[PDB]
Amino acid sequence: TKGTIYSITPCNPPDQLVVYQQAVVGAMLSENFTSYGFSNVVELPKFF
Amino acid sequence: IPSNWTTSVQVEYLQITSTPIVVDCSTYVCNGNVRCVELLKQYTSACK
Ligand SMILES: *[C@@H]1O[C@H](CO)[C@@H](O[C@@H]2O[C@H](CO)[C@@H](O)[C@H](O)[C@H]2NC(C)=O)[C@H](O)[C@H]1NC(C)=O
Ligand SMILES: *[C@@H]1O[C@H](CO)[C@@H](O)[C@H](O)[C@H]1NC(C)=O
Ligand SMILES: *[C@@H]1O[C@H](CO)[C@@H](O)[C@H](O)[C@H]1NC(C)=O
């Protein structure tokens, strides 16, 4: 119709998580959001 | 016997490290189809 264009991002990109002493702790993500019950999402270079 | 010398410089190069790569089995092959994931579910013995 007009000329606008749209990208198609995938729904669920893989997330990197960490475990220690047989429990999960911390998580490397892509979105500035607290997906799990973690109380803080420290923005860091190249990742959250 | 040798008398007073002159200086020179020689250059060498050594490989020291390789950029590591990591892969997600289920993303790579399934590509997000739940039924594909379920057919794969019986092969977790393999791709682990
Ligand atoms: C992570 O932090 C959250 C809150 O910051 C902890 O949550 C409490 O967990 C219990 C057990 O499920 C719930 O009954 C409470 O309602 C939760 N509180 C809130 C505010 O959601 C959680 O236990 C922490 N977990 C770890 C592993 O640190
Ligand atoms: C990330 O989330 C925090 C949470 O308060 C917010 O203050 C900040 O503006 C957000 N940044 C981006 C780039 O979304
Ligand atoms: C070596 O020594 C002699 C005498 O001191 C001098 O004439 C000559 O230039 C020197 N050579 C070098 C390469 O320094």
Curated annotation (Swiss-Prot), chain B:
Outcome of swapping residue 7 to I: In strain: Isolate P100E
Subcellular location(s) of the protein: Virion membrane; Host endoplasmic reticulum-Golgi intermediate compartment membrane
Function: S1 region attaches the virion to the cell membrane by interacting with host ANPEP/aminopeptidase N, initiating the infection. Binding to the receptor probably induces conformational changes in the S glycoprotein unmasking the fusion peptide of S2 region and activating membranes fusion. S2 region belongs to the class I viral fusion protein. Under the current model, the protein has at least 3 conformational states: pre-fusion native state, pre-hairpin intermediate state, and post-fusion hairpin state.
Domain characteristics, as noted in the entry: The KxHxx motif seems to function as an ER retrieval signal.
Entry similarity comment: Belongs to the alphacoronaviruses spike protein family.
Assembly and oligomerization: Homotrimer. During virus morphogenesis, found in a complex with M and HE proteins. Interacts with host ANPEP.
Protein's name according to its UniProt entry: Spike glycoprotein
Naturally occurring in which organism (per UniProt): Human coronavirus 229E
Residue span relative to the full protein: 584 to 631 of 1173
